[PDB]
RNA sequence: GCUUGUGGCAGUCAAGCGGCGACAUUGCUCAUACCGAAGCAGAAUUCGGUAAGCGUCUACUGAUGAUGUUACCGCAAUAGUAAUUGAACUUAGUACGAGAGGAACAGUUCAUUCGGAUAAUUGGUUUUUGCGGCUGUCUGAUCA
């Protein structure tokens, strides 16, 4: 089930895409074959929508969401918001944040039931994230890393953390998520696991450089089968 | 310096004559190949770039777009040309018998002092069934191979103190030259509009004389490959509106243009900056050939055009919007 | 050092080398001169040409030494492999001669340049200039013999397989081309001549394969009956970290007597005991029992033309080397099927629709065609006032002016 | 193109958590020719750390500019400038050293370097 | 599109006009013209400048809140659109302008009280 | 009908020239582009040729001055001429290749320099000698 692809000959799959259990988002740009990578492995399972965030190709890093909705930065344009709402199922809420941080994909990590946020985020937005996503939120830093969404990848089946997350760090975090966690690397030693790949309960895509042991580790920990 | 333009001497005249026209098309319907206009300042536009494979594909982009005042053009006559070993030669020319006062002024310098004895014997040549006029036209059909129309701008319709119509030739295209001269026959004393010669997204080139600097400036230039975005019917309303804005606006900015008056006739929005300052006459030609590129073929989904006063920093696009701004009045 | 040497520059023949350098200076230096020219200018004019000519020879000699590795400093394995294919004394002599020629060229420059810079006539500078370049031609001209040998080695050394002694390898050995040659191609993607004549292979081969997510490379011997060709395998067996596999036949291939193979095995027994050898075979048991005396060897009766037995031996060899809330899944996910590479009815992708539109780059990616609406009905259609429910609220806005249009002070 | 505001030899602060205090730029990677080509937002420039990690004395490493502080024209229409200029430390392949980046980060630079955007939380 | 109002003057900044400033706390600040940008550096207080809507509404020169004005409401909860909604909302814009213009029919003479 | 690329001394032999003697002979002393060959598998590369492209009082120019009189529109004999380098998508991780690595054609998108224009906007730039403010000087003084 795990797929090995690239965007514009780039191994950072999570930078230019954002996927969930109910919908898929892909960045537009000079290249277009990246769209077919998900379509070939998804088809009609979940919709795939071409869209930009603030005119950038880093949608994956600038946005965070779950199967029940999407969370977009303060700089999102109404044209993108209106187009996104009209190209997604009814059960997908969209709203902008009002906070100093903008790179939601790097500053925030969420799954279908639990979420992790920057400890310095304001208290007001914590309620909004829970309400919009319908998920629990915990202020946490993976092994002291401040950008949880960039160095951590989470899902219902399991999660992945950057290699510096020792076993002690993995175990303590597993209590909050109550799921198995593995510390390693993707795309042949890329410490940014979150940006290097995107995974859900039934599909995982990684960069071309992803070695066989790395691909198998992702498959085993995330319980693809 | 660039030896392609040297020596950097004076231009021939304020008006620039088109040295070359589109080659030929002996199958397409007869139509004009050029037009005339004036430099109506400049403005700014915002549009979504539908160019594939671009760094800003589907993103909004800002670009300065020049507006040229192109009032309707009326044909005063036609010119026939015949190939010769020494080059093309003008065989014969005819006139419409009712040349406007603006055209009649073009042939006089001290117009007020002159008796104003313009075309009179030629005008009397129309006192019969056209035997004299038709015979001169017949030889052009029998002998001429390429036909150029004599037309002038409706200067009286422009906010210019000149009132002296600019007169220049425009080359025709089409097969069966008999039809080409017949086309001119119908248009004698009639007017033509830019919409019948140009269209949106078409690629054109403009030729004019650059701004002077009191040995600098005052030279003819032919900056090629300028894209037409909008060809607006200035006489009609909502010329400055857009499909996705649907608010009635006029392209003329508040307070008009610098050193230019209001626009009340047909106009063309052109990419880039056509050479020549304000009040300078510009002649339009279409690409000199069938250019084929993605940039040329790409259409423009115009979103919004800036129409704010340039005499300082603008705030509103129309006085009606200024209501959301008074002791001196009440 | 890396396991590849294809980057060595080509060693041009002495006849071609002489022309290249001499012609290079002529085209890259001035030629017009007259006896009336200044003495200082003439000497400088000739000095640059002489200096440039010497540099050209030095550059080629300098580059040759850089590209060619030192035979005794690469690796104990590659040391002998190069020595067996390229005689050490001849190899060192060629490199040593090149260095000597370069040193003589430097002597040529120092001797004549000093003499030339103190000249006082055009002929003296001109004649001395020819003398300076005359010895360079003579030195190179007599160097033709070693140069030819270097080029032959250069065109062959770079072609040698990039075998890595350090990483894991699987040596293949046995009676000449008794099933062994075809074995390498079976393990992984590789090509070896299968025509079964005695010495079907004259040089080493490598075939890469992965097990346990770890890289392995199988190595095939040229053949063992001494012969110089066979000497290549002897050093490969000794200086390569591997568990060598011995090949034999019992019933089908070559019909050769196992007695000779067993006796030949004992000849190599002392040398390659430290490799945990294994024996593969395509009173017979008693003959093999003599080889079984070594605890670290096993006999595997097998067929060399099917994968089942190939993996049986390989699997043991690989071990020997190393012995040293609930998730949400929409029903549509499992209702569909995995992508079919060639099914005409497969779910077509934008990667294919683009070709239908004239190409990839020319296709204008349309954000439409994947739209969700109650009904489209248009498909093509201060803007904050588009939110619904505003029209209903207008009922609480009409009567605002009724209380301000009939009272003074803004009337 | 955008207006240049970082001439060769300039010094500014560091916008990453690598611990560097200030950065000194001596050249621009892929330097053009004509007046030297001043650096700009998103460009990679060879820079040396003035103060911070003591081991970096006279050490030149590639750096990516994330702020310019000089007003420039953007294709988005608006003209804007940053409060201060700063860069980040990364290898030629874009492997950011600092695990996190703070402060304004140019939108063009973030899109140009996928990993830098992943390491930036205050982009735009 | 959907231009933002200048914080220092409340004047909308059309595309290609005005300047913007990005701080470490960016909270993007937009200046409609060079005067506001230069004035902002000089620490001129909006509550004191007599020519900015911030002072005019704060000082009582004009009204502060109105029923139509409360619906500025830069909403961020889009719903699936339809042409009927778009067409109807256009009528609301005309009514919004009409009532707002009707509201723009009085306080610039209400302040004349005491100067009858 | 000067110039460049191949040494001094000594010795054998000789195609020939009529006893002399060519060459062989022994001793020491380009980064760009297009073609042809190269164990050139790919990438990169050398060699040879082509373009010599491409790089580490008077010269000039402003101005004036019988071809019936003037004005408009034209042709062109002639002189000059310009564009240049690099980068991203896709074709690609396919062809090739045990492996490591890894192209090309076509179709698209950008950036540097050079040059002709533009001042829509950004700026060095103020005799808006336009507003508001200030210092001395006012007239006895609100008025300057
Ligand atoms: Zn303002």
From Swiss-Prot, chain A:
GO terms for cellular component: cytoplasm; cytosol; nucleolus; nucleus; preribosome, large subunit precursor. Keywords: Cytoplasm, Initiation factor, Nucleus, Phosphoprotein, Protein biosynthesis, Ribosome biogenesis. Phosphorylation at Ser-174 and Ser-175 promotes nuclear export. The keyword Ligase does not apply. SUPFAM superfamilies: Pentein. One of its GO terms (biological process) is maturation of 5.8S rRNA from tricistronic rRNA transcript (SSU-rRNA, 5.8S rRNA, LSU-rRNA). InterPro entries: eIF6. It is found in: Cytoplasm; Nucleus, Nucleolus. The keyword Nucleus applies. Pfam families: eIF-6. The modification Phosphoserine is found at residues 174-175. GO terms for molecular function: ribosomal large subunit binding; translation initiation factor activity. Present with 18600 molecules/cell in log phase SD medium. Binds to the 60S ribosomal subunit and prevents its association with the 40S ribosomal subunit to form the 80S initiation complex in the cytoplasm. Is also involved in ribosome biogenesis. Associates with pre-60S subunits in the nucleus and is involved in its nuclear export. Cytoplasmic release of TIF6 from 60S subunits and nuclear relocalization is promoted by the GTPase RIA1/EFL1 and by SDO1. Also required for pre-rRNA processing. Monomer. Associates with the 60S ribosomal subunit. Belongs to the eIF-6 family. This is Eukaryotic translation initiation factor 6. It comes from Saccharomyces cerevisiae (strain ATCC 204508 / S288c) (Baker's yeast).
Curated annotation (Swiss-Prot), chain B:
It comes from Saccharomyces cerevisiae (strain ATCC 204508 / S288c). Component of the ribosome, a large ribonucleoprotein complex responsible for the synthesis of proteins in the cell. The small ribosomal subunit (SSU) binds messenger RNAs (mRNAs) and translates the encoded message by selecting cognate aminoacyl-transfer RNA (tRNA) molecules. The large subunit (LSU) contains the ribosomal catalytic site termed the peptidyl transferase center (PTC), which catalyzes the formation of peptide bonds, thereby polymerizing the amino acids delivered by tRNAs into a polypeptide chain. There is a cross-link at residues 28, 125 (Glycyl lysine isopeptide (Lys-Gly) (interchain with G-Cter in ubiquitin)). It is found in: Cytoplasm. Present with 450 molecules/cell in log phase SD medium. The modification Phosphoserine is found at residues 13, 145, 243. Disruption phenotype: A mutant confers resistance to trichodermin, a trichotecene toxin produced by plant-pathogenic fungi. GO terms for cellular component: cytoplasm; cytosol; cytosolic large ribosomal subunit. Its main location: cytoplasm. PROSITE patterns: RIBOSOMAL_L3. One of its GO terms (biological process) is maintenance of translational fidelity. The gene is RPL3. Belongs to the universal ribosomal protein uL3 family. This is Large ribosomal subunit protein uL3. The modification Phosphothreonine is found at residue 92. The keyword tRNA processing does not apply. GO terms for molecular function: RNA binding; structural constituent of ribosome. It comes from the Eukaryota. Keywords: Cytoplasm, Isopeptide bond, Methylation, Phosphoprotein, Ribonucleoprotein, Ribosomal protein, Ubl conjugation.
UniProtKB/Swiss-Prot annotation, chain C:
The keyword tRNA-binding does not apply. Keywords: GTP-binding, Nucleotide-binding, Nucleus, Phosphoprotein, Ribosome biogenesis. Its main location: nucleus. Coiled coil: none annotated. GTP binds at residues 174-181, 220-224. GO terms for biological process: assembly of large subunit precursor of preribosome; ribosomal large subunit biogenesis; ribosomal subunit export from nucleus; rRNA processing. It comes from the Eukaryota. The keyword Phosphoprotein applies. Residues 168-322 form the OBG-type G domain. GO terms for molecular function: GTP binding; GTPase activity; RNA binding. It is found in: Nucleus, Nucleolus. GO terms for cellular component: cytoplasm; nucleolus; preribosome, large subunit precursor. Present with 28000 molecules/cell in log phase SD medium. Involved in the biogenesis of the 60S ribosomal subunit. Belongs to the TRAFAC class OBG-HflX-like GTPase superfamily. OBG GTPase family. NOG subfamily. Associated with nucleolar and cytoplasmic pre-60S particles. Directly interacts with RLP24. This is Nucleolar GTP-binding protein 1.
Curated annotation (Swiss-Prot), chain E:
Signal peptide: none annotated. The keyword Ribosomal protein does not apply. One of its GO terms (cellular component) is cytoplasm. It is found in: Cytoplasm; Nucleus. GO terms for molecular function: ATPase activator activity; ATPase binding; structural constituent of ribosome. Keywords: Cytoplasm, Nucleus, Phosphoprotein, Ribosome biogenesis. Its main location: cytoplasm. GO terms for biological process: assembly of large subunit precursor of preribosome; positive regulation of ATP-dependent activity; ribosomal large subunit biogenesis. Belongs to the eukaryotic ribosomal protein eL24 family. Associated with nucleolar and cytoplasmic pre-60S particles. At the end of biogenesis it dissociates from cytoplasmic pre-60S particles and is likely to be exchanged for its ribosomal homolog, RPL24. Interacts (via C-terminus) with AFG2 (hexameric form); the interaction is direct, recruits AFG2 to pre-60S ribosomal particles and promotes AFG2 ATPase activity and RLP24 release from pre-60S ribosomal particles. Interacts with NOG1; the interaction is direct. Involved in the biogenesis of the 60S ribosomal subunit. Ensures the docking of NOG1 to pre-60S ribosomal particles. Activates and recruits ATPase AFG2 to cytoplasmic pre-60S ribosomal particles. This is Ribosome biogenesis protein RLP24. It comes from Saccharomyces cerevisiae (strain ATCC 204508 / S288c) (Baker's yeast). The lineage of its organism: Eukaryota, Fungi, Dikarya, Ascomycota, Saccharomycotina. The chain holds residues 1 to 116 of 199 of the full protein.
